[PDB]
Amino acid sequence: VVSLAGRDLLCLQDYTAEEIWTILETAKMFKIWQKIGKPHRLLEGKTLAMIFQKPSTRTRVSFEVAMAHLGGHALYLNAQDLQLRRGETIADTARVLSRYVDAIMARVYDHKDVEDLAKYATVPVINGLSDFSHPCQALADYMTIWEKKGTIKGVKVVYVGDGNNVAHSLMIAGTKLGADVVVATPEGYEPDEKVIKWAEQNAAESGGSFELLHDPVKAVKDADVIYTDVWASMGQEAEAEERRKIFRPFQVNKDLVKHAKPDYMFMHCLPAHRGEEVTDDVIDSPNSVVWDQAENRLHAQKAVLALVMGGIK
Amino acid sequence: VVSLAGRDLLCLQDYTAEEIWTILETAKMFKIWQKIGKPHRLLEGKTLAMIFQKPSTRTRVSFEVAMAHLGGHALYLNAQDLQLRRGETIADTARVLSRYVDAIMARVYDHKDVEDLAKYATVPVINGLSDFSHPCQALADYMTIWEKKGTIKGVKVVYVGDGNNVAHSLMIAGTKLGADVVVATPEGYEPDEKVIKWAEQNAAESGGSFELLHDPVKAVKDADVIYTDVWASMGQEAEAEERRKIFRPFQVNKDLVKHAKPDYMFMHCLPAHRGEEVTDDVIDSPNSVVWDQAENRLHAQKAVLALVMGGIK
Amino acid sequence: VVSLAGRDLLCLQDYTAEEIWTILETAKMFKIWQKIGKPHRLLEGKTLAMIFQKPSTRTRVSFEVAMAHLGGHALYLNAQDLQLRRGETIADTARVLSRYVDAIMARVYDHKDVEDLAKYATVPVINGLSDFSHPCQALADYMTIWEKKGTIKGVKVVYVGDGNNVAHSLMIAGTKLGADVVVATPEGYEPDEKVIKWAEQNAAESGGSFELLHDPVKAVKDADVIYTDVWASMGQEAEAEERRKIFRPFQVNKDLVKHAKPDYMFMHCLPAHRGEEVTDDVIDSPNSVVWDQAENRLHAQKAVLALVMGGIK
Amino acid sequence: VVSLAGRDLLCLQDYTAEEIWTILETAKMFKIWQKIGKPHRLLEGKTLAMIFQKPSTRTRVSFEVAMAHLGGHALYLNAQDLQLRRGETIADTARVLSRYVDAIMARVYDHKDVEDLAKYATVPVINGLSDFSHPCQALADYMTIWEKKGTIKGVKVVYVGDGNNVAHSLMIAGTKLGADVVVATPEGYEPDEKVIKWAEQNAAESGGSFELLHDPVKAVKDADVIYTDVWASMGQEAEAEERRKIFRPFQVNKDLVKHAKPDYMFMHCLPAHRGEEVTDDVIDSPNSVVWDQAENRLHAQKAVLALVMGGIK
Amino acid sequence: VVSLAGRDLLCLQDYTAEEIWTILETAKMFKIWQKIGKPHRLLEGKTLAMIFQKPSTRTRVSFEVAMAHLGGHALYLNAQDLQLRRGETIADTARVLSRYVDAIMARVYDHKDVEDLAKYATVPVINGLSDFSHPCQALADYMTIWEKKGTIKGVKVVYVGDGNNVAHSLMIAGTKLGADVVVATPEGYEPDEKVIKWAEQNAAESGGSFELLHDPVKAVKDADVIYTDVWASMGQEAEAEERRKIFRPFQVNKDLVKHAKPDYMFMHCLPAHRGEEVTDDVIDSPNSVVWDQAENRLHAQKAVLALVMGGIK
Amino acid sequence: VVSLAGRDLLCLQDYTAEEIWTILETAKMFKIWQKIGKPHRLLEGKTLAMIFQKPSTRTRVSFEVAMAHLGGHALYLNAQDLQLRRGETIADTARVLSRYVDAIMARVYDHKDVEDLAKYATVPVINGLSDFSHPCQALADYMTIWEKKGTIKGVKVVYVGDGNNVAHSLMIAGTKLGADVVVATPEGYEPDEKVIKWAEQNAAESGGSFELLHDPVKAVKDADVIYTDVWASMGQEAEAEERRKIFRPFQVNKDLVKHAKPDYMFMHCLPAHRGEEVTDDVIDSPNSVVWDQAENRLHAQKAVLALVMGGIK
């Protein structure tokens, strides 16, 4: 294990497999503490400023509950209080905030904002969701796979659907952890080339693999976990619901799933659009693991805060 | 007294008189603890997610202060973060939330929502206000009557004005507790028939009574407590202020009150529209009890949280 | 030092120099406690209701972090939950709130509102910002000057730009503390005459001085600290950016500053509009003290809460 | 309330109504503490020797759990370890035991034994069950009636079946508490005359009443609570199951019960012989209260130990 | 890991591999805590009623010591106090007991009794030994194999001798955990067909295997652990010591063992009948692991109590 | 004083006078702690397994109360749970028990059993009573003499009656402590020759003495303490009450006692058979000290547990 004291968590490609393992182990520990009822208020009086430039309840309550469990306090800054680059330069808000709080967690559209926030920060900055990546989710996801499957190594996890931020992060972490990851997406909707390049170099070292495809049924062959997420042009509606014809084939359903292992795990980072990317039969099939996966958002984030704030000096 | 560990509080007709008494006694106890300065952080590290689909400060601060006193933490979810049936099925948000928090308190329009929330919950669900009922208010109200009057039994409490959610709850509880309750409302504005039926069966058992009327001065005869609330077509304005001509006669004022006992108590669940349902002379007369009644919202809710979360197993 | 138990903090002209010194000393103490890592949860279970009628992050997080450090809890009431004089008379909300919380801190436009709030309160009311004054800022400001300069007495602090609320408060406190204060503003934009009168009577007693001027370069002569703030017709834009021609001469820049002492301190209460009232060269010059000044908002407010709530009886 | 420090609890006729009320109030308090999860280890290191001359699980686990909750320790002495008058004079075992433990609770056949035990004791002696009386059960019983019914005063509690030890105690307490008690038993099986005499003198003072009868249906008329217990010649079997013909008419069943109030409570001190003294329809009817009644054995005994051992001097 | 809060432990076929792993991990943790001397009284004031319908010291002291370590209290109910279906219906004793204690652990002959106990319970019920299964032993056993061998997966554990309750449980767990399990028994003495069917379906999923045989030397080939237990017609004696001729060939001895791996582990759940199923040379050979295995009964049960009682809500 | 950490207490001839003094001093200390109400839970979480092969309440409750006072837990194993050499070799039960508990205290017939128990133990073994000796009683006895008489040295303690286990131990300790001990017994009923030899060698070193006699009146001449115990063929009854004619002369009574010092102390280890070995006049004469002596069983054993378990390493 290694110290992460004072670190930022913008993107996992900055992390070594050992650092990402440090967080999963501490998280497993905290999860057990919690199941047996053992208190662990390790951050009394510590404060975490959560800046939300676009709502997200799962992230807001998982970070807020995580801090409460550790005895600290998360303040919730909204878009009606905190636009970033509007009433003051991002550098200035970072400077002042770092005089009051102990760590910042930002949920922002433009990844460059969370990056600017970190550069002038002085206090650890965590990325709860940007358009480029979602690290906290990957940690929860691989934590889940690790719990259920017993290992992350030779597991074929395949993501089907639009290549977005969580897709990026599933690639970066799994490939760093040694998993054989494959992503299948409609032709013009594949992950950013930079992260694809990343995924391949990462893969060499962890004897994992990465593989882009454009045919779901091929991708999902003999899969251990099938993962999906909501799809493109979010806010599209009938007035550009085009995502339907193109993405529709990718919908995780009874038939697609049939190509995976009998004991495959279905994952989705929520929210689900039952009917689109996934059907009732799947999310609710006993192969579904969406809730344990949701829960691990609490444990995993509980570990990164303790690790990056607790290691004080 | 009885355990309420794990129970939901959607409507008091599900509660026995003993269960409602359990909460009032624990509440009286907590109120005394508070007056003498004795701490009682019985829920350290416990979290309560408050979902507000429509604002309400009295409820928001009474639940939030109640949890702070017990050492726990209430997270406040707004309408800009949490519409219910919009970005995800109510069943799904209930499932995920119940993986993070320890109890949910919802303030929603449609009572069916709080009901759906409870069905998929796994964690206790409390109804802070729906269009059908307001249990937390009745508990505070009867707690107040119990304090001041010394008993709830043979007390004639009469509600005058539109038959709404608090009207429903005043009927359900008082009639369960043995009070002689009467509700007087303009002809087309009387409580839901289902709760009226409830009130009558309940009344048989607690030797109380219920009685619908349509003439305030008759209703308020020899009354111990006269209760009122804001009136109909809320948001009506001059463009359908019709509530004026019809409801106006019901306005609790110096003359109406004159028919009640000399030592009658005036109650209102706030907010007051001084000038409409009640006049300055009344809410501010020494017969008014609106503030002690407001305060008991803290003590009563402090008891239901401790009772339904504290009794853990 | 003196007790401030139960006091309100609407405006510092109500305070004696000893009372304002009591708060600065307690604040210095709390700042040292904090630097050495010594806990001081003096207000466990205490709650502070923050009413924001107009956003302000620096105030919101400084009060919220201050209460967390003391072990209490601040509830944040927004404009979407709490308009003041809309759904209920300010007297009524004050009455009910004072049945739940231990102190109220209001950020409101009309100073008369914070004044009405205090009159019906029962619980201490603190003014986090009104259009007439900003006491919490002056305390932080003079605390900063006291730290850096070693004294407040014979220090010439000069404010340049529109005479607003913070201008009012810089005058009232500095002049009460014995500083030689001067305010320079464009001809039709000078501080309220009432506070100017105040500043002069105050000055007699503390052998300080006050002096209105309309020429920045004269004002800033041999100055110890040069202070500025954002300027007039806020929300003006190009459609009445008139503030430009008139205020432009007042812009704190390399040349203006050149008239001050070599070791002068530049202060600004933030937010800064780099380019308008101040330029990059100044706020970022090593003479700038804007961040220590921002930080002292935490320590100073931490002292007023402890002082006005801690002294319980 | 009054001190019971150092007292013995052999029979309730030695207790005043105030003393029996002291124990019920302390018990109600402890019950609430328990429902909210508030610890109360008031007897750390204290030990209670339980002597069982004839098995009884309900008593053994209720006393043992009660002491664990208070942080003390109950040692369980069986008939294979402790016959009383066999290997040593009862006076001698009492003397030695009182050098080791803090209170003794004995479950013995001959009431004279528990009486001898107390005479040489030095340490409080509690009677968990003798052939003459069962005080701990009456306390639980009247506690239950008090909880459910709201008072003990004008409540008609009627016991039907063999007049035994619990019958004795129901008479002694209820009549001391002001209840209108009636006992109906087959002709040759009525309570001891001494306790019947007691019941009548007691009744005068508490405006209650007592009344022996020999016709169940008459006895149960308009009853609030109908109570029964197992019946005569225990161990009789077919070889003297005579109790059948004679007692059979007394069996609490659907028809008998029909004469009581609609909201009557059915009580039984357990064990039940479903089929004999009571039928499935009754013990399991929602009018049955046998389990809350069983539970109150814990709370009531928790109060007598705390009261008679806690009040140390 | 997963919550087991409120669960019963009658048979491990109800448990997922993850749930059984949750308990082993928590157990490993508690074992380390214990070796370093770190306290963990996680269940203060909690009580566990142990019902023994047939003696068993190893189980009685392991559960009793486990609860003492956690700060709770186990009450021991014997056959002289608690026959089940004798003086009262099993449903009734379950109801009353669940009003006093926090969990029940039963050691009974007929598995249907422990099943009935759980159905009317309200409080978690643990099966310490029935004629169908012994879950607590399997957990200890696989915990031991996991410690020593480093994994449970590809380990060939073979059980030789009468197919009884522990045989059932070794099959159910090992096969659920992925081990290659084989059971060899004399022709008419093989495990129940239902559990054999279970073992095979379970095996498919955990890439383990199961295999019934009737020739010990074949069974023990290349085995990692050789397990045995006492044999048939217990209480048989010379007057039906028939078990001798038939079972004798199965006796684990120097020769049989010789077919296993050099580093094989010998396990037995005790009591041993040195001379029958195993010889001095084996139980005492350095390949024997019977005591570490016995010890893990403490750690494993310490984990299930903490897990099923500690996770309170 | 000296450490006794990890020691066994089978027989006091293994102990030096300093070791036996270490225990008496620690015992005196614990007795004072207890009289002033000072807690001393020195063995939290520690467990003591008491194995009783033949009942004994005084020993069972003194060890059980002693452990409760120290915050540990004694488990009571009976003859219906633990025969020693029946269902498993004594070596095996010792091995397993020593994996669960922290010390063992055995009450067994055959001293060789307690000796075998200790040989395979790993955990301290204490002998609460065997047929050869009763160490815990001697410690209490000499503690008593030490308290009352002020010293043990030149005190003539004489034992009259059958030479049994306590006789053995009175000889071994007193003679080790320097007392002048004499034992008088009917001709064929004198202490084992081995311990008599012991007593004489021991006596040389502590300038005490030992002396066997067969005439009580001579023995009791000028005695400081006269000690007796129950007599021979226990279970004899009229069908071999022969002990009467032979032992009768030895009965401690008014006349015999008359030969002792005026301030002599009468001791008996209980149980007393008032009428046989001693008469009412003696055990109850103010010269009797049987109860203080009984009480010191608690203090003395409280010291050996703390000493042999507390000194951990």
CSV table of N, CA, C and O in Angstrom, one decimal, chain F residues 59-109:
chain,number,residue,atom,x,y,z
F,59,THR,N,-17.7,-23.1,46.1
F,59,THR,CA,-16.6,-23.0,45.1
F,59,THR,C,-17.1,-22.3,43.8
F,59,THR,O,-16.4,-21.5,43.3
F,60,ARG,N,-18.2,-22.8,43.4
F,60,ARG,CA,-18.8,-22.3,42.1
F,60,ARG,C,-19.1,-20.8,42.2
F,60,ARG,O,-18.8,-20.1,41.3
F,61,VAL,N,-19.8,-20.4,43.3
F,61,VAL,CA,-20.1,-19.0,43.3
F,61,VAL,C,-18.9,-18.1,43.7
F,61,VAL,O,-18.9,-17.0,43.3
F,62,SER,N,-18.0,-18.6,44.5
F,62,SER,CA,-16.9,-17.8,44.9
F,62,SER,C,-16.0,-17.5,43.6
F,62,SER,O,-15.5,-16.4,43.4
F,63,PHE,N,-15.8,-18.5,42.8
F,63,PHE,CA,-15.0,-18.3,41.6
F,63,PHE,C,-15.7,-17.5,40.5
F,63,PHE,O,-15.2,-16.6,39.9
F,64,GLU,N,-17.0,-17.7,40.4
F,64,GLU,CA,-17.8,-17.0,39.5
F,64,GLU,C,-18.0,-15.5,39.8
F,64,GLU,O,-18.0,-14.7,39.0
F,65,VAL,N,-18.1,-15.3,41.1
F,65,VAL,CA,-18.3,-13.9,41.6
F,65,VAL,C,-16.9,-13.2,41.4
F,65,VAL,O,-16.8,-12.1,41.0
F,66,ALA,N,-15.8,-14.0,41.8
F,66,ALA,CA,-14.5,-13.4,41.7
F,66,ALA,C,-14.2,-12.9,40.3
F,66,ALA,O,-13.6,-11.8,40.1
F,67,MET,N,-14.5,-13.7,39.3
F,67,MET,CA,-14.3,-13.3,37.9
F,67,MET,C,-15.1,-12.2,37.5
F,67,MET,O,-14.7,-11.4,36.6
F,68,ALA,N,-16.3,-12.1,38.0
F,68,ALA,CA,-17.2,-11.0,37.6
F,68,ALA,C,-16.6,-9.7,38.1
F,68,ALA,O,-16.6,-8.7,37.4
F,69,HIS,N,-16.1,-9.7,39.3
F,69,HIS,CA,-15.5,-8.5,39.9
F,69,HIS,C,-14.4,-8.1,39.1
F,69,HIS,O,-14.1,-6.9,39.1
F,70,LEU,N,-13.6,-9.0,38.5
F,70,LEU,CA,-12.5,-8.6,37.7
F,70,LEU,C,-12.8,-8.3,36.2
F,70,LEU,O,-12.0,-8.0,35.4
F,71,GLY,N,-14.1,-8.4,35.9
F,71,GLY,CA,-14.5,-8.1,34.5
F,71,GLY,C,-14.3,-9.2,33.6
F,71,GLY,O,-14.4,-9.0,32.4
F,72,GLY,N,-14.1,-10.4,34.1
F,72,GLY,CA,-13.9,-11.5,33.1
F,72,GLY,C,-15.1,-12.3,33.1
F,72,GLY,O,-16.1,-11.9,33.6
F,73,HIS,N,-15.1,-13.6,32.6
F,73,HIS,CA,-16.2,-14.4,32.5
F,73,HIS,C,-15.9,-15.9,32.8
F,73,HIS,O,-15.1,-16.5,32.1
F,74,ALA,N,-16.6,-16.5,33.8
F,74,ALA,CA,-16.4,-17.9,34.1
F,74,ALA,C,-17.5,-18.7,33.4
F,74,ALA,O,-18.6,-18.3,33.4
F,75,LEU,N,-17.1,-19.8,32.7
F,75,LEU,CA,-18.2,-20.6,32.1
F,75,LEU,C,-18.3,-21.8,33.0
F,75,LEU,O,-17.3,-22.3,33.6
F,76,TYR,N,-19.5,-22.3,33.3
F,76,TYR,CA,-19.6,-23.4,34.3
F,76,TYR,C,-19.9,-24.7,33.6
F,76,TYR,O,-21.0,-24.9,33.0
F,77,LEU,N,-18.9,-25.7,33.5
F,77,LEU,CA,-19.1,-27.0,32.9
F,77,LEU,C,-19.4,-28.0,33.9
F,77,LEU,O,-18.6,-28.3,34.8
F,78,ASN,N,-20.6,-28.6,33.8
F,78,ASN,CA,-21.1,-29.6,34.7
F,78,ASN,C,-20.7,-31.0,34.3
F,78,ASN,O,-20.1,-31.3,33.3
F,79,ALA,N,-21.2,-32.0,35.1
F,79,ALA,CA,-21.0,-33.4,35.0
F,79,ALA,C,-21.9,-33.9,33.8
F,79,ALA,O,-21.6,-35.0,33.3
F,80,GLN,N,-22.9,-33.2,33.5
F,80,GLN,CA,-23.8,-33.6,32.4
F,80,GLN,C,-23.3,-33.1,31.1
F,80,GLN,O,-23.8,-33.4,30.0
F,81,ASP,N,-22.2,-32.3,31.1
F,81,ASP,CA,-21.6,-31.8,29.9
F,81,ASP,C,-20.2,-32.3,29.9
F,81,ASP,O,-19.6,-32.6,28.8
F,82,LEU,N,-19.5,-32.4,31.0
F,82,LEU,CA,-18.1,-32.8,31.1
F,82,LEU,C,-17.6,-33.7,32.1
F,82,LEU,O,-17.3,-33.4,33.3
F,83,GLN,N,-17.8,-35.0,31.8
F,83,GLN,CA,-17.2,-36.2,32.4
F,83,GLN,C,-15.8,-35.9,31.8
F,83,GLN,O,-15.6,-35.2,30.8
F,84,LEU,N,-14.7,-36.4,32.4
F,84,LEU,CA,-13.5,-36.1,31.8
F,84,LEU,C,-13.0,-37.2,30.8
F,84,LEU,O,-13.1,-37.0,29.6
F,85,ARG,N,-12.7,-38.3,31.4
F,85,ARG,CA,-12.2,-39.4,30.6
F,85,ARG,C,-13.3,-40.3,29.9
F,85,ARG,O,-13.0,-41.5,29.7
F,86,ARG,N,-14.4,-39.7,29.5
F,86,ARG,CA,-15.5,-40.5,28.9
F,86,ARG,C,-15.6,-40.4,27.4
F,86,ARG,O,-15.3,-41.4,26.7
F,87,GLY,N,-16.0,-39.3,26.9
F,87,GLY,CA,-16.2,-39.2,25.4
F,87,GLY,C,-14.9,-38.8,24.7
F,87,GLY,O,-14.9,-38.7,23.5
F,88,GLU,N,-13.8,-38.5,25.4
F,88,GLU,CA,-12.6,-38.1,24.8
F,88,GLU,C,-11.4,-38.1,25.9
F,88,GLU,O,-11.7,-37.9,27.1
F,89,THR,N,-10.2,-38.4,25.4
F,89,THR,CA,-9.1,-38.4,26.3
F,89,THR,C,-8.8,-37.0,27.0
F,89,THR,O,-8.8,-36.0,26.3
F,90,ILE,N,-8.6,-37.0,28.3
F,90,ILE,CA,-8.4,-35.8,29.1
F,90,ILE,C,-7.4,-34.9,28.4
F,90,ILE,O,-7.5,-33.7,28.5
F,91,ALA,N,-6.4,-35.5,27.7
F,91,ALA,CA,-5.4,-34.7,27.0
F,91,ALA,C,-6.1,-33.9,25.9
F,91,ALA,O,-5.7,-32.7,25.7
F,92,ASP,N,-7.0,-34.5,25.2
F,92,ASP,CA,-7.7,-33.8,24.1
F,92,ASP,C,-8.6,-32.7,24.6
F,92,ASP,O,-8.7,-31.6,23.9
F,93,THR,N,-9.4,-32.9,25.6
F,93,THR,CA,-10.3,-31.8,26.1
F,93,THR,C,-9.4,-30.6,26.6
F,93,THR,O,-9.8,-29.5,26.3
F,94,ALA,N,-8.3,-30.9,27.2
F,94,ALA,CA,-7.4,-29.9,27.7
F,94,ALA,C,-6.9,-29.1,26.5
F,94,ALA,O,-6.8,-27.9,26.5
F,95,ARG,N,-6.5,-29.8,25.4
F,95,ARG,CA,-6.0,-29.1,24.3
F,95,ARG,C,-7.0,-28.1,23.7
F,95,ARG,O,-6.7,-27.0,23.4
F,96,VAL,N,-8.2,-28.6,23.4
F,96,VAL,CA,-9.2,-27.8,22.8
F,96,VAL,C,-9.7,-26.6,23.7
F,96,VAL,O,-9.8,-25.5,23.3
F,97,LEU,N,-9.9,-26.9,25.0
F,97,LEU,CA,-10.3,-25.9,26.0
F,97,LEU,C,-9.2,-24.8,26.0
F,97,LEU,O,-9.5,-23.6,25.9
F,98,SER,N,-8.0,-25.2,26.0
F,98,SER,CA,-7.0,-24.2,26.0
F,98,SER,C,-6.9,-23.3,24.8
F,98,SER,O,-6.0,-22.5,24.7
F,99,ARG,N,-7.7,-23.6,23.8
F,99,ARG,CA,-7.7,-22.8,22.6
F,99,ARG,C,-8.8,-21.7,22.8
F,99,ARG,O,-8.9,-20.8,22.0
F,100,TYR,N,-9.7,-22.0,23.7
F,100,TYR,CA,-10.9,-21.0,23.9
F,100,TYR,C,-10.8,-20.2,25.2
F,100,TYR,O,-11.1,-19.0,25.1
F,101,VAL,N,-10.4,-20.8,26.3
F,101,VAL,CA,-10.4,-20.0,27.6
F,101,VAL,C,-9.0,-19.6,28.0
F,101,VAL,O,-8.0,-20.0,27.5
F,102,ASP,N,-9.0,-18.8,29.1
F,102,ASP,CA,-7.7,-18.3,29.6
F,102,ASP,C,-7.1,-19.0,30.8
F,102,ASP,O,-5.9,-18.9,31.1
F,103,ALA,N,-7.9,-19.7,31.5
F,103,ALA,CA,-7.5,-20.5,32.7
F,103,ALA,C,-8.5,-21.5,33.0
F,103,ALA,O,-9.7,-21.4,32.5
F,104,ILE,N,-8.2,-22.6,33.6
F,104,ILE,CA,-9.1,-23.7,33.9
F,104,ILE,C,-9.1,-23.9,35.4
F,104,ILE,O,-8.1,-23.9,36.0
F,105,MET,N,-10.3,-24.1,36.0
F,105,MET,CA,-10.4,-24.4,37.4
F,105,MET,C,-11.2,-25.7,37.4
F,105,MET,O,-12.3,-25.7,36.8
F,106,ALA,N,-10.6,-26.8,37.9
F,106,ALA,CA,-11.3,-28.0,38.0
F,106,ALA,C,-11.6,-28.5,39.4
F,106,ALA,O,-10.8,-28.4,40.3
F,107,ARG,N,-12.8,-29.1,39.6
F,107,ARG,CA,-13.3,-29.6,40.8
F,107,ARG,C,-13.5,-31.1,40.5
F,107,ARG,O,-14.4,-31.5,39.8
F,108,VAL,N,-12.5,-31.9,40.8
F,108,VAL,CA,-12.6,-33.3,40.5
F,108,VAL,C,-12.3,-34.3,41.6
F,108,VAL,O,-11.6,-33.9,42.6
F,109,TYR,N,-12.7,-35.5,41.5
F,109,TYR,CA,-12.5,-36.5,42.6
F,109,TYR,C,-11.0,-36.9,42.6
F,109,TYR,O,-10.3,-36.6,43.5
